[PDB]
Amino acid sequence: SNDPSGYNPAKNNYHPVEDACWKPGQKVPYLAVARTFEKIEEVSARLRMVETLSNLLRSVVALSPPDLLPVLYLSLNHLGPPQQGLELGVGDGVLLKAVAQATGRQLESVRAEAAEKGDVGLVAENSRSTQRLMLPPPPLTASGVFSKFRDIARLTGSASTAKKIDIIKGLFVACRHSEARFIARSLSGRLRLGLAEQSVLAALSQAVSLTPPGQEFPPAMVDAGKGKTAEARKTWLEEQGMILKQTFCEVPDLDRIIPVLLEHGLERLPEHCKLSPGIPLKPMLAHPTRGISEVLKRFEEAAFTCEYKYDGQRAQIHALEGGEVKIFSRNQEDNTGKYPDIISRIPKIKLPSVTSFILDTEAVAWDREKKQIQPFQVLTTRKRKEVDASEIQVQVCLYAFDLIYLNGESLVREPLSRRRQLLRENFVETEGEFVFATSLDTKDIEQIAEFLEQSVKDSCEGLMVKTLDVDATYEIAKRSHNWLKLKKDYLDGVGDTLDLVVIGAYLGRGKRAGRYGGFLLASYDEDSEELQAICKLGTGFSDEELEEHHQSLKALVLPSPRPYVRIDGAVIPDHWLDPSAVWEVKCADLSLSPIYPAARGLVDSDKGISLRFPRFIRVREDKQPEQATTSAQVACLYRKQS
DNA sequence: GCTGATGCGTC
DNA sequence: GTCGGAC
DNA sequence: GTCCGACGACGCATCAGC
Numbered sequence: 001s002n003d004p005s006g007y008n009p010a011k012n013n014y015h016p017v018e019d020a021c022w023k024p025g026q027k028v029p030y031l032a033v034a035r036t037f038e039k040i041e042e043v044s045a046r047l048r049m050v051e052t053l054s055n056l057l058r059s060v061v062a063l064s065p066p067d068l069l070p071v072l073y074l075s076l077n078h079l080g081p082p083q084q085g086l087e088l089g090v091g092d093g094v095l096l097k098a099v100a101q102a103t104g105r106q107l108e109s110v111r112a113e114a115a116e117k118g119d120v121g122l123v124a125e126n127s128r129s130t131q132r133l134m135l136p137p138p139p140l141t142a143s144g145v146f147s148k149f150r151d152i153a154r155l156t157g158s159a160s161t162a163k164k165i166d167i168i169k170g171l172f173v174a175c176r177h178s179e180a181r182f183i184a185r186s187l188s189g190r191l192r193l194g195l196a197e198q199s200v201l202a203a204l205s206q207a208v209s210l211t212p213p214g215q216e217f218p219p220a221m222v223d224a225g226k227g228k229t230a231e232a233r234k235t236w237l238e239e240q241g242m243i244l245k246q247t248f249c250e251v252p253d254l255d256r257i258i259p260v261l262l263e264h265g266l267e268r269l270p271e272h273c274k275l276s277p278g279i280p281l282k283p284m285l286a287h288p289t290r291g292i293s294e295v296l297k298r299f300e301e302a303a304f305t306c307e308y309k310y311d312g313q314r315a316q317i318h319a320l321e322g323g324e325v326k327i328f329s330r331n332q333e334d335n336t337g338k339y340p341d342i343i344s345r346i347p348k349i350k351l352p353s354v355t356s357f358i359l360d361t362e363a364v365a366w367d368r369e370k371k372q373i374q375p376f377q378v379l380t381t382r383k384r385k386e387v388d389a390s391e392i393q394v395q396v397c398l399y400a401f402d403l404i405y406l407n408g409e410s411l412v413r414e415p416l417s418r419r420r421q422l423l424r425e426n427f428v429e430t431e432g433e434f435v436f437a438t439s440l441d442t443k444d445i446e447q448i449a450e451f452l453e454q455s456v457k458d459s460c461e462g463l464m465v466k467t468l469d470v471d472a473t474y475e476i477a478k479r480s481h482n483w484l485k486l487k488k489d490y491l492d493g494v495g496d497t498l499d500l501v502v503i504g505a506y507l508g509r510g511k512r513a514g515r516y517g518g519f520l521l522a523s524y525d526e527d528s529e530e531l532q533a534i535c536k537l538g539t540g541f542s543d544e545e546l547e548e549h550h551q552s553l554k555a556l557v558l559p560s561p562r563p564y565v566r567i568d569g570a571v572i573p574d575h576w577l578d579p580s581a582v583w584e585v586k587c588a589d590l591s592l593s594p595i596y597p598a599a600r601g602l603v604d605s606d607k608g609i610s611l612r613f614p615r616f617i618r619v620r621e622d623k624q625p626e627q628a629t630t631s632a633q634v635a636c637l638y639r640k641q642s
Numbered sequence: 643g644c645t646g647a648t649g650c651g652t653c
Numbered sequence: 654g655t656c657g658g659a660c
Numbered sequence: 661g662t663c664c665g666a667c668g669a670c671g672c673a674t675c676a677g678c
């Protein structure tokens with residue numbers, strides 16, 4: 001058809017056949033995908049992005065259904081189902097090396113341009129590949145590009161990085177128009193679309209509803225909404241959207257869903273893809289809540305429970321009929337090999353009447369000598385894969401807080417009151433191994449405030465708050481953040497704030513391109529009279545405040561660092577700043593740092609101290625660097641976490 | 643055979 | 654993980 | 661409220677470099 005360079009999936013009255021830029025049965029050109037990404041990136045309304053992607057997907061369904069799965073993965077910037085663990089092994093480092101080689105430029109020139117533009121894609125797009133012959137290779141296809149990404153991910157072992165670079169250079173030699181922009185962005189993990197998983201699902205359900213799969217070509221039905229009123233069409237697409245979303249939340253695996261969609265259609269989907277032990281599901285998440293009054297505003301008169309928010313890692317534990325056990329992370333990564341200790345303890349936690357289950361738990365590092373919870377930083381020293389039981393050094397205690405499936409029954413549509421009762425009755429607590437989350441069922445503001453204080457004294461982050469009977473199910477498609485998280489550091493004037501010195505700035509990427517995206521901060525070490533880097537900072541300022549920072553710090557730029565500023569192994573700022581600006585910064589906790597020099601030697605011989613979840617609060621106009629938080633004060637704050 | 647750099651996961 | 658922007 | 665993408669610390673697994 002038309003040249004893909006003119007493809008317009010944002011067109012009014014888009015016709016899936018007549019407005020496609022490829023012919024029936026042809027492989028979807030990658031430029032059609034790139035042009036769709038361009039039209040998505042250009043707008044800010046999600047509904048417009050969804051419509052534009054839906055248009056592409058409808059053409060793929062009508063003309064080239066085998067390319068639906070790769071086009072979806074390209075749009076998500078995924079390589080496959082998360083539990084399979086495919087990794088490119090390519091970050092900005094390898095990518096920039098490949099761009100420099102492909103274009104015949106020095107690495108430092110490419111690296112500087114990428115930082116100034118805030119986007120590796122703009123560098124790859126606007127320089128020619130010097131491996132080009134006079135006549136270019138054939139145009140890239142969507143399935144071809146996706147398969148090359150998978151080729152990169154499958155390369156392993158010694159000398160594999162050079163082989164990955166060879167594939168990347170091969171892609172850039174074949175790119176036309178905007179293709180190199182989005183190839184580079186995909187490899188760097190920054191597509192910049194404004195459209196991600198929820199909008200992709202909305203576009204997919206819309207596409208297969210409007211243009212049904214499986215029709216004989218040319219399709220008799222290219223727009224199944226045309227005979228409906230706008231109102232009826234909206235209700236219908238909402239209903240179809242929810243069928244897809246709820247299925248995906250139970251089975252978040254397009255390798256499973258898309259073959260079924262193409263063969264049987266969306267209405268029959270839940271009959272083929274259902275929640276089942278052994279298939280990871282999307283977990284229920286939590287909305288930050290900045291005080292107890294906000295909890296009551298949110299839940300109104302509905303009864304709720306408060307639970308300790310344990311400071312570990314989420315572990316979704318699956319016991320299949322027949323005895324097999326699998327464990328998955330919050331993001332569906334397979335963690336079974338990480339927890340041989342947990343797997344051996346399953347017979348100890350479940351009563352013998354339990355034949356299958358999916359449990360929702362927090363894995364927390366546990367000191368068996370002292371019988372107490374250990375920090376997250378201890379938990380993260382566990383080995384990750386193919387771990388044998390005898391070698392475990394850091395023991396774990398599971399804190400169980402939900403039950404999603406039991407003895408063949410999905411509990412996703414059941415109220416927490418019932419799920420929790422089934423949990424409490426069919427599982428067995430053992431101190432230091434498997435325990436139900438500490439909880440309080442109350443509506444008393446004074447009791448809740450005291451329970452929050454106690455959770456912190458008992459080594460937890462705060463509270464989780466969950467309704468028991470009103471909108472109390474585990475239906476992620478209806479509300480993915482159905483629980484509330486209440487932390488003391490959310491409250492204004494409560495928690496540890498530090499006054500820290502701005503000693504450097506980093507050029508922004510993406511939404512921050514053309515200004516500063518982050519800053520390097522320092523505490524004041526009284527004893528050496530030096531400023532010591534403590535953390536970087538990149539959230540907490542409004543867009544207006546960030547522009548004010550850019551204009552107020554420009555006069556402080558230095559060509560070289562001051563000799564009394566120490567950053568050791570911290571990332572060197574793009575712009576050094578004369579120490580002057582002092583900012584109020586809040587954090588959740590202080591951590592022992594392998595890189596930052598702040599307070600090194602005061603708590604640990606080799607490690608200084610950094611901030612967990614730092615965020616900007618406000619400028620301290622009334623403070624100069626000498627009155628910033630001292631490194632000794634930092635050490636005192638760390639110690640009193642106990 | 644060992645260490646440092648990079649990637650990508652956890653929070 | 655926190656946060657603010659756009660809807 | 662939802663969705664999204666800016667940005668944070670940090671540590672294991674892997675591979676480049678030696």
Ligand SMILES: *P(=O)(O)OC[C@H]1O[C@@H](n2cnc3c(N)ncnc32)[C@H](O)[C@@H]1O
Pocket residue numbers: 285286307308309310311312313314315330361362401437464485
């Ligand atoms: P994020 O800060 O969004 O918080 C959600 C995670 O908190 C962990 N968690 C600890 N303890 C609980 C309880 N009692 N209930 C729910 N979630 C809890 C989980 O790992 C969440 O992913």
Ligand code: NA
Pocket residue numbers: none
């Ligand atoms: Na994130």
